[PDB]
Design a protein around this ligand. Structure first.
Ligand SMILES: *[C@@H]1O[C@H](CO)[C@@H](O[C@@H]2O[C@H](CO)[C@@H](O[C@@H]3O[C@H](CO)[C@@H](O)[C@H](O)[C@@H]3O)[C@H](O)[C@H]2NC(C)=O)[C@H](O)[C@H]1NC(C)=O
Ligand SMILES: *[C@@H]1O[C@H](CO[C@@H]2O[C@@H](C)[C@@H](O)[C@@H](O)[C@@H]2O)[C@@H](O[C@@H]2O[C@H](CO)[C@@H](O)[C@H](O)[C@H]2NC(C)=O)[C@H](O)[C@H]1NC(C)=O
Ligand SMILES: O=C(N[C@H]1CCS[C@H]2CCC[C@@H](C(=O)O)N2C1=O)[C@@H](S)Cc1ccccc1
Ligand SMILES: *[C@@H]1O[C@H](CO)[C@@H](O)[C@H](O)[C@H]1NC(C)=O
Ligand SMILES: [Cl-]
Ligand SMILES: [Zn+2]
Length: 604
C-alpha cells in the first residue's frame, strides 16, 4: 500500500473519529474507482487477462480496507456506538468491518479467484443441441414464447444442468471462506451480516408477518393460472391439486408470469395491453427506450443522464463476439462523474420496465454523489431496488401508454380494469414467494443448517413450499439448481427484492397523494408532478445518512413496511380471482406435494 493511502494517528475519542473519517474519505474515492473500473472492463469483456486485472484491483482494495479497518477497530471499537453524531456512527461502524480483508493473503487470492470463476461460468454457459444457445437472448426467448412442452423442457433442463452442475464445488469453497472472513467481524455467519443492513431486531419475524398477509393473493392467482395450463396441456401434464411444472410460466425461474398473459387474459375483446408489437412496428431501439425513461425523470424535475452516461454505457449486447455479463446492472464509479448501465437490452414492454428499474439506480447515484462514500447507499438495499419500479407503475397504466403512443384505444370499464390488474399481478404478485425464499435458502447454507449434501433437497423444499412448483425432470444432489440463478454465483443478496415489491406500493400511494390525484390508486399517473418529484428527491439525497425507518416516516407517514397499499392497489382483481376460483371449484394450494410430471413420449 502506497504511503499516501495509509492512515495517520488520531486520538481515541469522538473528535478524533471525525478527523479519521474525513481522512478516510479523502483517500477512498481513488481506491473505489480503480476497483469499479477493473470490474467494468471484465463484465463488458470476459477474458482471463481481464479477470486477472480485476483480482489485482480487488487485492489493493483489501489492503486499503485492512489498514483503515484495523486502525478504526483499535481506536474506536468500544465506543463508536455511543457517539453523538449518527452519520459518524454509520461511517465508523462500516470501516471497522473488514470482510474479506480479514483473510490472510493466500486465502484472499483464493476468494477473489472464486468470484471470477463463478461469474465466468454463469455468464458463458451454453445449451447445445444434439451453434449453441445463450441464456440471453436465446433461452430467454424460448421460455417466453414457445408453447411446446418438450421444447420448454429441453431449454429448462439444459440451462439448469449447464450452469448449476459445474458451479457447486466452487460455491462450497466460497461459502466457507466468506464465513471465516465475517466471523472475525463478530457475525455468526455471512447471512447475519447481510441481515444487519436492515437495522431491525425483529426482521425475520416481520417478513413472515408480511408474507402471511400476501399469501392468499398468490394462492388464487396460482390456481387460476393452473386451470389455464390444464386446458392447454391437459391432465397428463397438469395436476389440478399439485405443484405446477417449473418450465411453463414464461420465465426460466418461474419468477414472473407476464409472458403467458396471452393465455389467461380474461377479456380479449378489449385493447391488447401487450404493446411489444407496436414498439417494433414503430422502430423502437434500445437508446429510444432509455430516452423515454429519462424524460419521465425530467418531467418530475429530477436529473437527466449526463454525457458520461451515454458515452460509457453498454445498452445492447455486443455484436462483435465478445463474451459479456448480460444481467442488467447499474454502476457508480465513486468519482462523482462516471455512472453507467450495462444491459443486453431487448425491445419489449417488459424490458422497458427493466430500463426504468436500472435508471432508478442511476438517479439515486446522481442525487447523493456529494455525501461521503460510506453514505452513498440506499436508506436500505430495498429502497435502491424500488425507485425505478415506482415510476414504471405509472408508465404501465393504459392512460400513460396512450400518451406515449403505444396504446390507441381508450376504455374505462370494469372489464378493462380487470385485464390491467391481472397483467400487473402476473408480475408483482407471482414474484412474491420467489423474492422471499431465495435468501431463506442462502441463510440456511451460511448457517450450516443446509450442508452441501442437501443444497438441492432444501432448494426444492422451499420452491415447492412457497411457489407451489415442481421440477419437470428428476433432480438429485449432483444438480445445483440454485446456482443457475444469476444472484447466487454472482453473490448478490436477494431479500432486497421482496422488500422492494412491498415498498414500491407504499411509495406509489404517497406520491399519488402528494400529486393531488384523487381517483383509484391503480389508475394514478404521477407524470409531470413536480410536487411528487420533490418528495422523492428528499429520499434520494439522504443516501444512508439516516435510519431508513425515519426516511420512510417522512415520505409515507409510517415507519414500517406495510402490505396494505399493495392490497389496496390490487383489491378489485383479488375479489374477481376468488370468485372465478370458487365457481370453477378449485383447490387452493398443492396438497399432492409429491407429484411430478411424466416425460414427453420420446424425449429428447
Ligand atoms: C374511470 O371511471 C371511474 C368511475 O367508474 C372513475 O373513478 C372515479 O374518479 C373520480 C375522479 O375524482 C373519483 O372522485 C373522487 O371521489 C372521492 C370519494 O371519496 C372524493 O374524495 C374526491 O373529491 C373525488 O370526487 C371517484 O372516487 C372515482 N371512483 C368512482 C366514481 O367509483 C375514474 O376516474 C375513471 N378513470 C379515468 C382514467 O377516466
Ligand atoms: C442424478 O441424475 C442424473 C441425471 O438423470 C436423472 O436421473 C435419471 C434416473 C432420470 O430420471 C433423468 O430424467 C434425471 O434427470 C443421473 O445421471 C444419468 O443417469 C442415467 C441412468 O439412469 C444415465 O443414463 C445418464 O447417462 C446419466 N447422465 C449423466 C449426465 O451422467 C445420475 O446418475 C443421478 N444420480 C447421481 C448420484 O448423480
Ligand atoms: O437488480 C438488478 N437487476 C434486475 C434486472 C431484472 S428486474 C429486477 C426485479 C426483479 C427481481 C430481480 C431479478 O431479475 O431477479 N431484478 C434484477 O435482478 C441489478 S441492479 C442487480 C446487480 C447489482 C450489482 C451488480 C450486479 C447486479
Ligand atoms: C478485451 O480485452 C482484451 C484484454 O484481454 C483487450 O486486448 C481487447 O482490446 C478488449 N476488447 C474490447 C472490445 O475492448
Ligand atoms: Cl439485501
Ligand atoms: Zn436493481
Amino acid at each position: 500500500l502506497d504511503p499516501g493511502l495509509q492512515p495517520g494517528q488520531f486520538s481515541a475519542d469522538e473528535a478524533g473519529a471525525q478527523l479519521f473519517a474525513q481522512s478516510y474519505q479523502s483517500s477512498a474515492e481513488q481506491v473505489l474507482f480503480q476497483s469499479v473500473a477493473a470490474s467494468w472492463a471484465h463484465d463488458t469483456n470476459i477474458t482471463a487477462e481481464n479477470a486477472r486485472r480485476q483480482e489485482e484491483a480487488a487485492l489493493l482494495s483489501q489492503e486499503f480496507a485492512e489498514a483503515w479497518g484495523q486502525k478504526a477497530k483499535e481506536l474506536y471499537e468500544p465506543i463508536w456506538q455511543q457517539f453523538t453524531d449518527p452519520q459518524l456512527r454509520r461511517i465508523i461502524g462500516a470501516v471497522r468491518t473488514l470482510g474479506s480483508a480479514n483473510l490472510p493473503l493466500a486465502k484472499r487470492q483464493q476468494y477473489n479467484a472464486l468470484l471470477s470463476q463463478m461469474s465466468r461460468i454463469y455468464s458463458t454457459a451454453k445449451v447445445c443441441l444434439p451453434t449453441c444457445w445463450s441464456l440471453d437472448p436465446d433461452l430467454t426467448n424460448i421460455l417466453a414464447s414457445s408453447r411446446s412442452y418438450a421444447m420448454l423442457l429441453f431449454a429448462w433442463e439444459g440451462w439448469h444442468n449447464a450452469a448449476g452442475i459445474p458451479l457447486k464445488p466452487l460455491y462450497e469453497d466460497f461459502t466457507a471462506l466468506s464465513n471465516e472472513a465475517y466471523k472475525q467481524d463478530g457475525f455468526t455467519d455471512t447471512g447475519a451480516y447481510w441481515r444487519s443492513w436492515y437495522n431491525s431486531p425483529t426482521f425475520e419475524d416481520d417478513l413472515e408477518h408480511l408474507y402471511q398477509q400476501l399469501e392468499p393473493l398468490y394462492l388464487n392467482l396460482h390456481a387460476f393460472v393452473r386451470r389455464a395450463l390444464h386446458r392447454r396441456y391437459g391432465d397428463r401434464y397438469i395436476n389440478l391439486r399439485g405443484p405446477i411444472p417449473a418450465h411453463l410460466l414464461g420465465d426460466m425461474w418461474a419468477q414472473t408470469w407476464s409472458n403467458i398473459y396471452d393465455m389467461v387474459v380474461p377479456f380479449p375483446d378489449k385493447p391488447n395491453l401487450d404493446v411489444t408489437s407496436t414498439m417494433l412496428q414503430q422502430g423502437w431501439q434500445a437508446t429510444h427506450m432509455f430516452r423515454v425513461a429519462e424524460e419521465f425523470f425530467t418531467s418530475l424535475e429530477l436529473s437527466p443522464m449526463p454525457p458520461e452516461f451515454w458515452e460509457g454505457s453498454m445498452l445492447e449486447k455486443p455484436a462483435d463476439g465478445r463474451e459479456v455479463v448480460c444481467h442488467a446492472s447499474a454502476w457508480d464509479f465513486y468519482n462523482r462523474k462516471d455512472f453507467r448501465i450495462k444491459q443486453c437490452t431487448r425491445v419489449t414492454m417488459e424490458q422497458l420496465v427493466v430500463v426504468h428499474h436500472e435508471m432508478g439506480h442511476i438517479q439515486y447515484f446522481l442525487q447523493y454523489k456529494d455525501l461521503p462514500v460510506s453514505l452513498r447507499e440506499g436508506a436500505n438495499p430495498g429502497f435502491h431496488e424500488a425507485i425505478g419500479d415506482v415510476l414504471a407503475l405509472s408508465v404501465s397504466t393504459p392512460e400513460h401508454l396512450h400518451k406515449i403512443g403505444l396504446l390507441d384505444r381508450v376504455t374505462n370499464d370494469t372489464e378493462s380494469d380487470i385485464n390491467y390488474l391481472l397483467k400487473m399481478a402476473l408480475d408483482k404478485i407471482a414474484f412474491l414467494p420467489f423474492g422471499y425464499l431465495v435468501d431463506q435458502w442462502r441463510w440456511g447454507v451460511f448457517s450450516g443448517r443446509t450442508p452441501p449434501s442437501r443444497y438441492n433437497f432444501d432448494w426444492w423444499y422451499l420452491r415447492t413450499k412457497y411457489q407451489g412448483i415442481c421440477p419437470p425432470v428428476t433432480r438429485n444432489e449432483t444438480h445445483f439448481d440454485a446456482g443457475a440463478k444469476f444472484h447466487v454465483p454472482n453473490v448478490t443478496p436477494y431479500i432486497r427484492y421482496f422488500v422492494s415489491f412491498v415498498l414500491q406500493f407504499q411509495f406509489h400511494e404517497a406520491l399519488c397523494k402528494e400529486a393531488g390525484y384523487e381517483g383509484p390508486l391503480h389508475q394514478c399517473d404521477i407524470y409531470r408532478s413536480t410536487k411528487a418529484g420533490a418528495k422523492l428527491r428528499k429520499v434520494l439525497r439522504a443516501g444512508s445518512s439516516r435510519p431508513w425507518q425515519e426516511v420512510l416516516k417522512d415520505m409515507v407517514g409510517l415507519d414500517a413496511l406495510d402490505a396494505q397499499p399493495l392490497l389496496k392497489y390490487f383489491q378489485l382483481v383479488t375479489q374477481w380471482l376468488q370468485e372465478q376460483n370458487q365457481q370453477n371449484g378449485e383447490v387452493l394450494g398443492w396438497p399432492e406435494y409429491q407429484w411430478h410430471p411424466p416425460l414427453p413420449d420420446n424425449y429428447p
